Amino acid sequence: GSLTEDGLSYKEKFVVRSYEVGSNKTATVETIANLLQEVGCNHAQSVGFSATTTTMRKLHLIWVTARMHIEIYKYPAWGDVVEIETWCQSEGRIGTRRDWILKDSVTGEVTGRATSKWVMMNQDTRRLQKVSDDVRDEYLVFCPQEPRLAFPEENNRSLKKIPKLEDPAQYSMIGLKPRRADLDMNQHVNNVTYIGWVLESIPQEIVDTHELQVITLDYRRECQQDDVVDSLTTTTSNDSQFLHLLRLSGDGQEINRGTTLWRKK
Amino acid sequence: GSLTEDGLSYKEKFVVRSYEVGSNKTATVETIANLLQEVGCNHAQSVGFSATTTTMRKLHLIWVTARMHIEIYKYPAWGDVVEIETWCQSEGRIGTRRDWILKDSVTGEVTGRATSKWVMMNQDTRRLQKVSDDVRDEYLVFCPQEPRLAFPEENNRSLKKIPKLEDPAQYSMIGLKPRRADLDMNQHVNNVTYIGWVLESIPQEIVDTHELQVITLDYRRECQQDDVVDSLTTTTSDSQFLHLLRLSGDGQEINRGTTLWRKK
Ligand SMILES: CCOC(=O)NCc1ccccc1
Numbered sequence: 001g002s003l004t005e006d007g008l009s010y011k012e013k014f015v016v017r018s019y020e021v022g023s024n025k026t027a028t029v030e031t032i033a034n035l036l037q038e039v040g041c042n043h044a045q046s047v048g049f050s051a052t053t054t055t056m057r058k059l060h061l062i063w064v065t066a067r068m069h070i071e072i073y074k075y076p077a078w079g080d081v082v083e084i085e086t087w088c089q090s091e092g093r094i095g096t097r098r099d100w101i102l103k104d105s106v107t108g109e110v111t112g113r114a115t116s117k118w119v120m121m122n123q124d125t126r127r128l129q130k131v132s133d134d135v136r137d138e139y140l141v142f143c144p145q146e147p148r149l150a151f152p153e154e155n156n157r158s159l160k161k162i163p164k165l166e167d168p169a170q171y172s173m174i175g176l177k178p179r180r181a182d183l184d185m186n187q188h189v190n191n192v193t194y195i196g197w198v199l200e201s202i203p204q205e206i207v208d209t210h211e212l213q214v215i216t217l218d219y220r221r222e223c224q225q226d227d228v229v230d231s232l233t234t235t236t237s238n239d240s241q242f243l244h245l246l247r248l249s250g251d252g253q254e255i256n257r258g259t260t261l262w263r264k265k
Numbered sequence: 266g267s268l269t270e271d272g273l274s275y276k277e278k279f280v281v282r283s284y285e286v287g288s289n290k291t292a293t294v295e296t297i298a299n300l301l302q303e304v305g306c307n308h309a310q311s312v313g314f315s316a317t318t319t320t321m322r323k324l325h326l327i328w329v330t331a332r333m334h335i336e337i338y339k340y341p342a343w344g345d346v347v348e349i350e351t352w353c354q355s356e357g358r359i360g361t362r363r364d365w366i367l368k369d370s371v372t373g374e375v376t377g378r379a380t381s382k383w384v385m386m387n388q389d390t391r392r393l394q395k396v397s398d399d400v401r402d403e404y405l406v407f408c409p410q411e412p413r414l415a416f417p418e419e420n421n422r423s424l425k426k427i428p429k430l431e432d433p434a435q436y437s438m439i440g441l442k443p444r445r446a447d448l449d450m451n452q453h454v455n456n457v458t459y460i461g462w463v464l465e466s467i468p469q470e471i472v473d474t475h476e477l478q479v480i481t482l483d484y485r486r487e488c489q490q491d492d493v494v495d496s497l498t499t500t501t502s503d504s505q506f507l508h509l510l511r512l513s514g515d516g517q518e519i520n521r522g523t524t525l526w527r528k529k
C-alpha cells in the first residue's frame with residue numbers, strides 16, 4: 001500500500017482469503033474490520049510512528065477507540081480485491097477521527113465506509129483526558145486541515161446517542177471468553193473480537209436470511225484475558241434493527257453498547 | 266500466487282499483518298496454519314477445482330484431514346513476507362498427502378515445513394472409506410509421481426503414534442465454544458481453531474519463555490456449532506506436552522496431539 005500524492009491519506013489492496021468469508025462466500029464484517037486496522041497500522045508506519053507522538057511517549061499516553069461505525073453496501077467475494085483509503089482528522093481538544101472508504105478494485109465503486117472516534121488515555125492508570133495543543137501540533141501535519149468525512153450527511157446514523165438495553169433481553173449468549181488468537185501483540189483483547197461477541201446474540205435465522213448493513217459500537221471498558229462476557233440483543237424494529245449490550249458476567253459491568261441494521265437479501 | 270513451471274506445485278507470497286502476530290511481533294502458529302490453508306485453496310483453484318474431483322462429487326465424497334504436522338525454525342516478523350510452496354501426492358488407496366515449505370522471501374532460506382494426511386469421507390454419513398481409482402487417477406495428473414517429502418527422514422516426528430492423555434491432566438482449559446468467526450464457508454468449525462483450542466491449556470509462563478518448535482495433531486471427530494470443548498495438557502518431558510481435546514459432557518475425544526518448545 002502507499003501514501004497518496006499529497007501524503008495526507010493511505011491506500012492498500014487486499015485479496016479476500018478462503019477463511020475470511022462466511023456462508024455466502026463474501027467477507028465477514030469482522031474481516032472488513034481487521035483490514036480497516038491493518039491499513040490503519042500501515043498508514044501509521046508510513047508517516048514515521050515507530051503509535052505515539054513524542055509528547056504522548058513522555059506522558060505514557062495512547063490513542064484508544066471510543067466508537068467504531070461501519071456501513072457496508074457490498075461485501076467483497078472470496079478471491080476479489082478490495083481497495084481501502086484511510087486518513088485521520090483532529091477533532092480539536094476532544095480527540096481524533098480515523099475514516100475509511102472501501103472500493104471494488106475492478107469497478108472503482110464505493111462498497112463500504114467506516115468512521116471511528118479515538119481519545120487519549122494514560123496507558124498505566126487508564127484515565128481518559130483531552131488532546132493537549134503540543135500533541136495536536138505534532139500529528140496535525142499528517143491530517144487534511146479542511147474537513148474530509150466518510151459520513152457527510154446532515155443526520156447520519158454514525159453520531160446517534162445509544163441507550164442501555166433494559167433487562168430482560170430478547171436474546172443472549174452467555175460465558176464468552178477470549179483465547180490467545182483474540183489477543184493483539186500488546187496482549188490486550190483485539191477491538192474486532194468485541195464486534196464478534198456483539199453479533200453472537202443475533203439469532204442464526206437473521207444471519208441466514210439477512211445481510212448486515214450498519215454496525216455502531218461504543219467501547220466503555222476493556223475485557224481482560226481472564227474476564228467472561230455476556231452478549232445481549234433486543235429487536236428495536238424490510239429492515240431489522242437491534243440494540244446490543246456486552247457486559248462482564250462476573251458482576252454485570254458494561255463493556256460495550258451498540259445498534260445493528262440488517263436488510264433481507 | 267502461481268503454479269511452478271512444471272504445473273506440479275504452487276507458490277504464494279504473504280505480508281504478515283499487525284493482528285496476525287503475538288507479543289514478540291512474529292506470526293502465531295495459527296496465522297501460519299491459516300496461510301497454509303489459503304495457499305492450499307489457491308492451488309486447488311489454479312488446477313481447476315472452482316475441492317472435489319469427478320466421481321468424488323457423484324458419490325458425495327470430500328477430502329478431510331486425518332493429521333496436520335508443522336515444524337517452525339523462525340516465525341516471520343510483522344511486515345516480513347513468507348514464501349510458501351505447496352503440493353499434493355497420492356498415498357495409494359489409503360489417502361492423499363499435502364506438504365508445505367515456508368522461506369524468508371528476502372533470504373530464500375527455509376523457516377518452516379508442514380505435512381498433512383487426508384482421507385475420503387461421504388459428507389452426509391461421514392463414514393471414513395478410502396480412495397477408489399476414479400476418486401484417484403483424476404488427481405494424480407496434478408501430483409509429482411516420484412516422491413517429494415517436506416519430511417523425508419525415516420524415523421521422524423511427523424509419522425509417530427500419539428497416545429491418549431490419562432485423567433488427571435496436569436493442566437486444563439474447560440468450556441471452550443466456537444463463535445461465528447471460528448466457522449468456514451460451509452459453517453463447519455475451521456481446522457485452525459482446534460490448534461488454538463489445544464494450545465489454550467499450555468500455561469502462559471511456557472508461551473512467555475518458550476517458542477513452539479513442533480505441533481503434531483490428529484483429527485478424530487468434528488466439533489459442531491453448539492458443542493463445548495475441554496482442552497487437557499500434561500508435560501511428558503526443550504519442553505514436551507501431550508494434548509487431548511474432548512467434548513465437555515460425555516468426554517467424546519475430538520483431537521489428540523503433542524507440542525515441543527525451545528527456550529528463547
Ligand atoms: C490505528 C489502527 O486502528 C484501527 O484502524 N482500528 C480499527 C478498528 C477500530 C475499532 C474496532 C475495530 C477495528
Ligand SMILES: CCOC(=O)NCc1ccccc1
Binds near residue numbers: 302305309363457
Ligand atoms: C485444501 C485446503 O486445505 C488446506 O490446505 N488446509 C490446511 C490445514 C489443514 C489442517 C489444519 C489446518 C490447516
